[PDB]
């Protein structure tokens with residue numbers, strides 16, 4: 053019996069991705085063989101969550117902003133670094149990430165914590181174990197979509213110079229013409 | 231990190247380097263904030 | 271809690287649970303408690319806001335002197351939308367802090383609503399049972415005890431009516447604000463608001 | 464699905480399968496299901512398109528305004544073909560959006576026309592069973608349920624009629640397009656086309 | 657010809673800022689004598705973004721070397737038979753390291 | 764799947780302080796696991812001392828702007844220029860008073876072992892209770908937890924007051940009322 | 944200070960810059976924080 057990936061059915065399965073959510077076998081470059089799956093999945097969830105927040109925040113700041121912050125999305129980072137409101141995020145997220153590195157250290161040493169589980173579930177979404185696997189897969193799907201979403205947001209915004217849609221001026225007309 | 235890495239950081243040269251770096255930093259910052267103090 | 275037991279089913283959507291998008295089927299029944307607490311809170315705040323906004327649009331205001339120099343008519347001159355911005359910051363903070371006390375006391379009660387209590391049943395006496403604090407035992411909801419004359423079935427029917435009117439009030443208050451922000455979006459609104 | 468089992472053979476070609484090339488006999492079983500679904504889709508698209516093109520050439524247009532400043536007569540003044548460029552991009556955007564929804568919903572249904580589903584049978588009520596989505600139960604095919612008053616043999620006869628009409632429809636629509644592009648290629652197309 | 661090359665700046669802590677001498681070009685620092693400026697001029701670097709990006713690339717290469725050193729002792733260590741292939745080693749170091757290094761530098 | 768999660772940070776293992784009998788132990792808040800290294804009793808003795816100093820300081824800092832000791836020289840409404848302006852031989856006497864109290868209370872017990880060498884000697888139980896609230900043992904736990912929480916809040920509050928005064932240059936109440 | 948909500952609007956609408964011509968790659972490359980000589984120097988922490 054030989055295992056083939058469900059995403060690349062011309063390759064043999066890695067065999068290191070067993071017992072994980074979103075396990076279609078997408079790992080052609082074999083990072084799981086070298087690095088541990090716990091570290092890799094913690095990184096995946098961190099990128100997923102930060103990218104979801106980033107892609108929502110980029111679009112939101114394109115429309116609305118607080119009275120004190122009168123900057124656009126592109127110059128917001130520089131303006132707020134000058135103002136000191138990015139240090140206030142790096143200090144209060146760096147505290148969170150100090151606790152996070154303690155956590156990932158513990159789970160890599162085998163404390164029992166999962167890859168990206170912090171236990172943060174106040175409202176009780178998915179407290180039933182049956183729904184937790186489905187919600188984990190949906191989390192990964194939305195986050196992996198949001199990574200490309202934020203990448204497209206930033207790149208197209210800088211490339212076009214247009215506010216929300218990130219589309220060239222000619223793309224707002226005659227885009228369905230024979 | 232672990233008991234093993236904590237023991238390694240507790241080894242003599244690592245502790246001496248850390249403590250002397252802390253002492254040098256204290257002296258340097260004291261010099262920055264109270265420079266050129268020839269006498270009390 | 272469980273989407274079933276809750277009473278909000280009505281004739282307008284047929285005598286069934288109205289969950290078109292299946293939000294209730296992807297929750298662990300712990301969050302349905304939070305949703306009925308928040309639904310009722312939204313509906314109640316929305317109907318208070320709706321009657322207040324209608325009062326403001328009609329132009330009725332208190333006799334005068336909200337503050338020292340400011341008058342109620344002057345601070346509500348430019349309709350109800352700008353009235354909040356016009357109100358004094360001190361009195362605004364007192365409204366916000368009394369609401370903070372109310373919504374902190376409601377949360378601090380032991381059964382809660384998410385952890386096995388009734389979602390929607392705000393404690394009648396929020397400020398009692400607190401060591402080192404004193405309040406004059408005026409119960410927050412139904413201070414005069416209008417509900418004593420009501421039996422179980424009557425108050426169930428009235429809870430149904432509460433949910434219906436709160437939902438309608440949510441729609442109404444959002445209609446008011448959207449109609450102000452976007453002229454002509456709500457055609458049943460005049461120049462008063 | 465499998466060529467001998469399909470209601471494709473007709474009296475046009477001697478009651479025999481018409482595959483002058485060795486396609487159907489060279490391709491596997493599921494390729495034929497794909498081809499049959501594609502044939503039905505092409506036939507039906509062209510069957511609507513030929514009628515639409517005929518109406519556009521005739522100049523029969525709705526009385527009203529397509530947009531607040533544009534008239535159906537205005538977009539049809541440039542002949543049947545240029546009407547697609549004349550119509551607002553924000554309107555053909557909605558047309559392509561609903562077509563995207565219909566195609567994706569039809570493709571998402573499980574049995575699948577290549578994996579044990581009837582080829583050419585677009586599933587009725589495509590927007591049902593979808594989490595986080597509601598749509599009224601208006602059938603995509605026969606919303607008034609005309610098929611209910613038909614028998615299975617009559618329905619097979621009408622399936623054959625559908626196919627033989629759709630093939631002629633795609634012949635006709637390509638005739639219209641080539642008549643517009645290359646002048647005089649297709650006679651019977653006056654200056655209105 | 658006029659500007660003295662300099663790529664080190666001392667902080668002002670104990671009066672050591674005097675070491676930031678006048679090197680020309682409105683810059684104060686410690687004059688260097690490693691020839692790296694002339695090296696980069698020969699290489700064709702004319703701006704600082706190029707220096708910054710090759711520095712970042714060097715950092716990436718250093719991290720790659722640390723990873724390779726870990727990998728080739730703790731994960732996949734060769735054998736003495738692999739090590740003793742001196743003929744193949746000489747072939748690869750002559751044609752592969754030196755030869756292609758010179759070819760790439762010439763390009 | 765942590766066997767013994769921390770009651771405060773449930774994605775981390777239980778610290779040693781969580782499985783202890785001092786007051787306020789259940790929270791279990793110790794992300795850095797400093798209870799494993801530092802002696803736990805010695806740190807409650809420090810926690811309580813710091814909290815007591817800070818909850819004397821915070822009301823003092825907050826009310827010295829409003830009130831003055833009648834006739835005191837060198838008074839300034841903000842604590843920092845107040846200590847700058849006040850005569851040094853008043854701060855010296857305050858420090859001497861504090862040092863006398865500390866020395867006489869901790870006589871022959873100033874080290875982690877010498878202090879708490881006696882098993883009876885409890886963390887922070889210096890014996891200062893003239894009114895004898897501690898004889899009533901029903902509310903002793905309540906009072907201990909309240910002292911701990913108030914001391915911690917006072918540490919944070921005094922830190923905030925001092926640093927806000929550094930930011931603004933104005934006393935606590937003036938700086939606060941110039942926000943709204 | 945403009946406390947958003949009490950003495951100021953909660954959220955101000957953002958400046959709609961209108962859809963227009965694209966910029967040039969050189970234009971937004973000679974101001975980037977990683978591919979501009981002065982952009983690199985403007986990326987050092989002030990502190």
Ligand SMILES: CC(=O)O[C@H]1CC(C)(C)C(=C=C/C(C)=C/C=C/C(C)=C/C=C/C=C(C)/C=C/C=C(\C)C(=O)C[C@@]23O[C@]2(C)C[C@@H](O)CC3(C)C)[C@](C)(O)C1
Pocket residue numbers: 317318320321416417428435436438439441442443445446456457458
């Ligand atoms: C026509 C057209 O084109 O558009 C329409 C659409 C559009 C825009 C949406 C419109 C709107 C707005 C709408 C729909 C607004 C709706 C507002 C709504 C629904 C407002 C409820 C308030 C309820 C309160 C205050 C309850 C108090 C309740 C109290 C004080 C009690 O406890 C009463 C009670 O104690 C007694 C006395 C004793 C007992 O017997 C029973 C109990 C204990 C219960 C317009 C303007 O209609 C135009």
Ligand SMILES: CC(=O)O[C@H]1CC(C)(C)C(=C=C/C(C)=C/C=C/C(C)=C/C=C/C=C(C)/C=C/C=C(\C)C(=O)C[C@@]23O[C@]2(C)C[C@@H](O)CC3(C)C)[C@](C)(O)C1
Pocket residue numbers: 116291351352354447451594595596952953954955
């Ligand atoms: C006097 C007064 O009233 O002043 C007020 C009025 C005034 C000025 C109006 C104010 C304002 C502005 C405010 C508050 C603005 C708020 C803006 C806000 C909150 C904007 C959210 C956007 C969310 C997005 C884009 C989400 C898309 C989400 C998407 C694409 C989805 O639906 C995902 C989806 O998965 C679901 C969920 C269900 C699935 O079945 C289907 C799919 C997969 C598609 C203030 C500040 O309040 C002050």
Ligand SMILES: CC(=O)O[C@H]1CC(C)(C)C(=C=C/C(C)=C/C=C/C(C)=C/C=C/C=C(C)/C=C/C=C(\C)C(=O)C[C@@]23O[C@]2(C)C[C@@H](O)CC3(C)C)[C@](C)(O)C1
Pocket residue numbers: 510511513514609610613621628629631632634635636638639649650651
């Ligand atoms: C001589 C010469 O060279 O000529 C030239 C010029 C000329 C002739 C113009 C040319 C052309 C074009 C051609 C050949 C065009 C052909 C167009 C074609 C073949 C167009 C079909 C439409 C069918 C529709 C819309 C069906 C609707 C069907 C509907 C709505 C139903 O379901 C009806 C029904 O449900 C009821 C209501 C009740 C049920 O009980 C029964 C059913 C299910 C049935 C050429 C090629 O250039 C040649």
Ligand SMILES: CC1=C(C#C/C(C)=C/C=C/C(C)=C/C=C/C=C(C)/C=C/C=C(C)/C=C/[C@@]23O[C@]2(C)C[C@@H](O)CC3(C)C)C(C)(C)C[C@H](O)C1
Pocket residue numbers: 097098101102105118119120121137141145148149152944945946947
């Ligand atoms: C979730 C997650 C992570 C994360 C994350 C991220 C990226 C989180 C980001 C959070 C974010 C972005 C939070 C902003 C808050 C802003 C506030 C409170 C603003 C206050 C603003 C105030 C108080 C005032 C503003 C002013 O304008 C006012 C009103 C008046 C003006 O005169 C001037 C001033 C300046 C005074 C980890 C940790 C990385 C990994 C983990 O695995 C998953």
